[PDB]
Write an enzyme that holds these catalytic residues in place. Structure first.
Site, PDB file in Angstrom:
ATOM      1  N   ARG B  24       0.749  -1.401  -0.046  1.00 52.35           N
ATOM      2  CA  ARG B  24      -0.021  -0.137  -0.032  1.00 52.35           C
ATOM      3  C   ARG B  24       0.966   1.283  -0.113  1.00 52.35           C
ATOM      4  NH1 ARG B  24      -4.778   0.334  -1.367  1.00 52.35           N
ATOM      5  NH2 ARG B  24      -5.461  -1.670  -0.378  1.00 52.35           N
ATOM      6  N   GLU B 181      -2.142   0.010  15.865  1.00 53.02           N
ATOM      7  CA  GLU B 181      -0.887   0.944  16.002  1.00 53.02           C
ATOM      8  C   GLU B 181      -0.894   2.005  16.586  1.00 53.02           C
ATOM      9  OE1 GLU B 181      -1.194  -2.169  12.987  1.00 53.02           O
ATOM     10  OE2 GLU B 181      -2.184  -0.344  13.226  1.00 53.02           O
ATOM     11  N   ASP B 204     -14.259  -2.388   7.570  1.00 47.38           N
ATOM     12  CA  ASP B 204     -15.249  -3.362   8.092  1.00 47.38           C
ATOM     13  C   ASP B 204     -15.955  -2.984   9.353  1.00 47.38           C
ATOM     14  OD1 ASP B 204     -12.217  -4.166   9.253  1.00 47.38           O
ATOM     15  OD2 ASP B 204     -13.835  -5.167  10.640  1.00 47.38           O
TER      16      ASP B 204
END
Ligand SMILES: Nc1ncnc2c([C@@H]3O[C@H](CO)[C@@H](O)[C@H]3O)n[nH]c12
Ligand SMILES: Nc1ncnc2c([C@@H]3O[C@H](CO)[C@@H](O)[C@H]3O)n[nH]c12
Ligand SMILES: Nc1ncnc2c([C@@H]3O[C@H](CO)[C@@H](O)[C@H]3O)n[nH]c12
Ligand SMILES: Nc1ncnc2c([C@@H]3O[C@H](CO)[C@@H](O)[C@H]3O)n[nH]c12
Ligand SMILES: Nc1ncnc2c([C@@H]3O[C@H](CO)[C@@H](O)[C@H]3O)n[nH]c12
Ligand SMILES: Nc1ncnc2c([C@@H]3O[C@H](CO)[C@@H](O)[C@H]3O)n[nH]c12
Lengths: 230, 230, 230, 230, 230, 230
Positions: B24, B181, B204
C-alpha cells in the site's frame, strides 16, 4: 432528586462549569453570572444557575479527586440532562517549560487511579476531552488572544505522591500538569454521549515551584466564551 | 543505520506517512509522490521518499501491531530525526453510527496492550494524538469538505479477540474504530518531543459488518494536505 | 479467504516455516524448496508452497511482534488447516554464555506482553513449544551434529526496552535469547490442538554485543529436517 | 500552612472527628462542641475546634472519596500534629442482616482503589482501623449500651458501581457497609505512627434499600465518648 | 543448617525426589531405597537419603502449595548444593482425554500464583521444566515402555477454586493436569543454574471425576530410572 | 471424608488450634490437652481432638503457606462444621520496636499472594481477624497479664523474598511481623460466616535478627484461654 443534589431536572443549565473549590464556584457565580440562583447546596457544594450573555449556565463545585467529580458528573448527565461540563480550576505544572500562572487546556488526562480500568475491562481507556470542547476552548483562547498550552494532563489519586520518580517520568513524556478530576470526568461524558473538557491555571510547579488572579480571570474568560460557542 | 532501516540520516523527509501494508505504501509512493525514491526496503518495508507539492515527504510500511510500529517510529524520530508521523490506513468500525467506508480521525487510542503501562510505571497513559496533527487533519478535511468522524480509536493486540464482550463495551463508550498501532505510536512521539497522528478508512464493521478505494483516496488527500499544513 | 491471506484451503502445506522477514522467506523458498509457488502475498507477506525431499511445505513471513504472528498463525491453523508451524529466525542473546551466531531452540517463551493474560483469565500461561517439535528440532540438531542450545526464550513487545534492568534479571534466570513472536504462537497452537516450535540464530547480544549466514543455513537445515521428521 | 488548611500548628486538637459533609461538620460543631471556633474554611471545608467535656477537639469535613480524605488526613498528622482521626458519617449497608439506620464500626476497609497498592509495592495492604480506636468506639457503644455492628467496610471509588456483581460478592463475604474514605485514612495513620477509626450510620441499603437523625445522634455520642477515652 | 532442615551439607544426595505427602516420602524411602537414613525431619518433613542401584539419592516431602515447595527447593539448591529435584506425586486431570490413573510428565506449569510475577518484574515467566529432566523422564518412560502423557501442567493456589470457569478454559488450551508446586519449583532451579522436573499420577479428574497404586509404582519407576540417567 | 482428612463430621471440636509444624501440633496435644485422640493424620498432618478444662478442642497442623492452610481451613468450616480456628505459631518481626520472643496478636494480615484478589474481583480484600477472636485473645492476654503487641501482620508467599526493599516499607507502615497463612485463613472464615484469629511468637527479626519456649508456652496459654472464652 439525587443523594448529592436537591435540585430538580431543569434547574441546571445544559452547560455547567465546575471547579473543586465550592467557594470558588460561589465567587464565579457572583462575579460572572447574571441573576445567579442557588439551585443546589447539598454538602455546601454551591451549585448555582444564572446566565452569561443571555444564555443559561450553571456553576458548581465538584470536590477533590476522581471519585468525587465522578458522582457529580454522572448525576448531571444522567438526571439533570446536562450536555456539557467544562472543568475549570488550578493544577500543578510538570513540564519544565510550563510555569506558574500559565493556562493549560487538556486534550486528555492520564491517571494512577483504577476507576477507568474498572469500567474498561482492565484495559487502557484514553480519558479524552471532547474534541468539540477542546476546540471551543482553544478558539476562545485564540479569539481572546490569550496564550494557552494544549496537551496531556494527569489526574492523580495522591496529591502527596509516594512515587517521587513519577514527576520526572511525566516530564519526559511532556505531560503539562497535574490535577485530580479530568481522568474521571471524560469517560463518564463518553458513556452518556455528552461532552466534557478542562482548562486550568497553573498554581504551582511540582518540579521546582517558583498576579495569580489575573491568570484565573483569563482562564474564566476562555471557559465562559467557549461555553457560549458550545 | 538501524537493524530495520538501511537508509541514512537525511534520506527520510521530516514528515512520514505510514500504513501497515508495505504494498500500500509502494502504491501511495507511486500514486501521489513525485520522483519517489526507495530509501529503505529492509524486510520489504517499502520505504520511499519523494515530494508532494514541492515539499519532501516519505512513506513507509510499519507492519501490524504496536510492537511493530514502535520499532519503526522510534528509529525514525531518534535516528532519522523525523518530526511528524501520520499513520494512514484501515480500521474496523465499532460504533453503530459509524459505517464501512467512513473516514475517522483519532484524537487518541485505547489499548489492551501492556506497552504503555510498561513505559508509564503501570499507570494509565493516555495515548493522545498530537493536537497539531489532529487539527491539521481536521482542517484539511474541512477545506476539502470531506466528512470525517473525529474521536477515540482502539489499538488491539488481538485482531481475533477472545473477549467478545469488549466490542459492545467500546460501543457504549463510543469508540469509533479499532486498528493496531496508534496507541503505540503516540506515546513514542511524546517521548521524542515530536508529533504523531492517525487517520483511517473503515474497511469493516465488527458489530455487524455490512467504492472502497474512493474513500481511501479521500483519506489520502486529507493526510497529504495536512502534511503540507504541518 | 482471510483478510491477510488470498490463498485458499489446500494451498498451504500442513507444515509451515515462518520468519519475520518476508524477503528472508522468499529467499528460503528459492534456496531450499523445489518448485516453490507464491500462494499468498497480501501485504508482501511472501507466502510460498513447494516441496522439500518430496514433501509439501510452505514458508511465509509473519511480521514483527506477537500481535502480528498471532494473526497469521490463527488463520493458518483455523482456515488453512495447518498442523505445524516452526518459527525460524534471528534473536538477541541474553545469557552471557550464549554468543552471537549461536543457534537456540526454545522450550518456551516468557513475555512482557498482555495477550496471554487476556486469553488466560489474567493468570500465568506458560507459552510452551510443542514437545514434538522441540524433540524433532533437537534430534535434527543431533543427527546433523550441529551444536544448539535448548531453553527459555523471551518474546518482547519492546525491541527498545525502557526497563534496562530486565536484561540482567533474565540473565540471572538463564533465559537464552529474545525475539518477538514465540510467546504468541505457542498458545494459539495449543488452542487449535496443533503444534508450534521455534529455532533462532543469535544475531546480536544485548548484554555486550560482540560467517553469519553459515549459522543461518545450519539453523535452516535443522528446521527443514525436523519438518520432515514431523 | 497547607494548600488546603489556613490554620496553623496548634489550632487543631489532637483528636479530630471528620465527615464528608462540611455542613454536617458545622452542625456537629454547633451541636456538640462548646465554644467552637472556625479554624479553617479553605474550600468551605468547615474546620472547627472547641471542647467536649473540657477536652480540646476538632471537627472538619473531608470531602468524598479516598483521594480527598487522603489530602486532609496526611496534612493533619504531618503538619498539625494530630494524633487521632475518627471518621464519622453515613454508609450503605451491604449485608442482608444489616438494615438502614444501623450503626457500624469498621475493623478495616477493603477497596477497589489503587492508592494502597501504589504505596505498598502493588501488594495487599490491609487497611486496618487502629485497634485502640476500634476498642474505644466499641466500649463507648457498650457503656452507652447502643447496639452497633463491628466488622469489615468497603471504600469504593465508584458510588455508581458498573460492576453490579460486586455487591453480592461482598455480601457473601459479610462486608457490613460501603463508604468512600476509610481505606485511604487507615494506612496514612499507620505511616505517621498515629491512629484512625471509623463509625457510620447506615443511610441506605444497596441490596434492597428499605428517625434517621436519632441513629446519627447515637453514633455521634459513641464517637464523642470514644474520643474522650482516647 | 536451615530453619526447615536440620541436616548438613552433604547429607542430601545431588538428586532429590520430592512429593507433598511426607508419609508418602517415608514409604518411598522404605520401598525403593537401600539403606535409607533419616537426614531431616524438621516439621515431620521426612527427609531421607539412601541409594538406588548404588547411586546416592534423597527423598523428602515438600508440603502443599508453591510457597511451601519454594522454601525447601531453594534451601536444597543453595545450602545443600542439590543439582536435581524431581517432583513426584499426584494431580488432577483437566483434559477430557486424560483419565484417572494416567501418568503425566510436565513440560511446564502455568499458575494463578503471584510468585513468578514478583520475581520477574511483573511479566510472564514461563515456569519450564529442565529439558534434561523432561528428556530423562520421557526416555525412562520409553525404555520401560510405560505410557505417559507429556505437556502443560497448572499449579494452583486454590485447591478449591472459586473461578469455576478456569477448568474449562484450561481444557480448551489442553492443559493436562493440576497440582500445586511445579510452577514454583522450576524458576528456582533456573535461578540456581540447577535442574527440576515433575511427573504425576492422575488421582482425580476435575471435569468429571470417574489399581491406583499400580499407576503410582510405574510413575516411581520412571522417576527413579530417570534419576539414574541424570 | 476429605482428600486431606480421614476423620468424619463430629471428630473435630468446634474450635481448632492450628500451627504449621505438625510435630508442634502433636506436642501441643500431648502437653495441653487431656485425653487427646488422633482424629486425622493424612499426610502426617497430626490432627488431634481432646479437651481443655472440660471443653472439646482440636489441634492440627496446617503446613506452610496460604495455599496449604486454605485447604485445611475450608474443609474444616465446610465439612467438619468447625466454628473457630485460632492460628498459633511463630513469625518474623518486622517493626524495629518488636523483638525476638515477643508475642503478637494479628488484627489483620497483608500479603503478596494473589488468592484474595482472585476471590475478590481483583480488588483489595482486607484479610481481617474476627473481632471476637481478637478480643478473646487480647482479654486472655490481659487476664493472664502477658504483654502482647496487637496489630498488622503480613502473610508472604516468599519466605526468601527477592524484593529486599519490602521489609523496610513494611517497617515504615508498622507491620508487626511476617508469617505465611493468616491472609488466607481470615477471608475463608468470612465466607463461611465463621471465625478465625492468629497469635504468634516472634522467632526471628528480619531487619536485624538478634528462653524461646517460655514465650511459646505463654502464647499457648493465651490461645487456650481465649478458646475457652469463645
Ligand atoms: N499540584 C497539584 N497536584 C494535584 N492537584 C492539584 C490541584 C487541584 O486542586 C486540588 C488539589 O489541591 C485538586 O482538585 C486538583 O484538581 N492544583 N494543583 C495541584
Ligand atoms: N477490524 C480491524 N481490527 C483490527 N485492526 C484492523 C485493521 C488494520 O489492518 C491490520 C489488521 O487487519 C492492522 O494493521 C490494523 O491497523 N483494519 N481493520 C481492523
Ligand atoms: N535482540 C533482539 N530483540 C528482539 N527481537 C529480535 C530479533 C527478531 O527480529 C525482529 C526484531 O529485530 C523480531 O521479529 C525478532 O523476533 N532479533 N534480534 C532481536
Ligand atoms: N451507599 C453508599 N455508597 C458509597 N458511599 C456512601 C456514603 C458516604 O457518603 C458519600 C457518598 O454519598 C461518601 O462520602 C460515603 O462515605 N453513604 N452511603 C454510601
Ligand atoms: N486435583 C488436584 N488439584 C490440585 N492439586 C492436586 C493434587 C496434589 O496433592 C495436593 C492437593 O491435594 C497438592 O500437593 C497437589 O500437588 N492432587 N490432585 C490435585
Ligand atoms: N520470618 C518468617 N517469615 C515467614 N514466615 C515465618 C514463620 C512461620 O513458619 C513458617 C516459615 O518458616 C511459616 O509457616 C510461617 O508462618 N516464622 N518466621 C517466619
Amino acid at each position: 432528586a439525587t443523594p448529592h443534589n436537591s435540585a430538580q431536572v431543569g434547574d441546571f443549565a445544559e452547560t455547567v462549569l465546575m471547579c473543586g473549590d465550592p467557594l470558588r464556584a460561589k465567587l464565579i457565580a457572583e462575579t460572572y453570572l447574571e441573576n445567579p440562583k442557588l439551585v443546589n447546596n447539598v454538602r455546601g457544594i454551591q451549585g448555582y444557575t444564572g446566565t452569561y450573555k443571555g444564555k443559561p449556565i450553571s456553576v458548581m463545585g465538584h470536590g477533590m479527586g476522581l471519585p468525587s467529580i465522578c458522582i457529580y458528573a454522572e448525576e448531571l448527565y444522567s438526571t439533570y440532562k446536562v450536555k456539557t461540563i467544562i472543568r475549570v480550576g488550578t493544577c500543578g505544572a510538570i513540564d519544565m517549560d510550563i510555569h506558574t500562572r500559565d493556562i493549560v487546556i487538556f486534550t486528555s488526562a492520564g491517571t494512577n487511579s483504577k476507576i477507568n480500568r474498572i469500567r474498561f475491562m482492565d484495559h487502557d481507556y484514553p480519558a479524552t476531552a471532547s474534541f468539540d470542547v477542546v476546540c471551543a476552548l482553544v478558539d476562545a483562547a485564540k479569539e481572546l488572544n490569550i496564550p494557552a498550552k494544549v496537551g496531556k494532563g494527569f489526574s492523580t489519586d495522591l496529591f502527596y505522591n509516594p512515587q517521587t520518580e513519577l514527576a520526572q517520568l511525566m516530564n519526559k513524556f511532556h505531560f503539562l500538569a497535574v490535577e485530580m478530576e479530568s481522568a474521571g470526568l471524560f469517560p463518564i461524558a463518553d458513556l452518556y454521549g455528552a461532552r466534557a473538557g478542562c482548562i486550568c491555571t497553573v498554581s504551582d510547579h511540582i518540579l521546582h515551584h517558583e498576579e495569580r488572579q489575573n491568570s484565573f480571570q483569563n482562564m474564566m474568560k476562555i471557559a465562559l466564551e467557549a461555553a457560549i460557542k458550545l
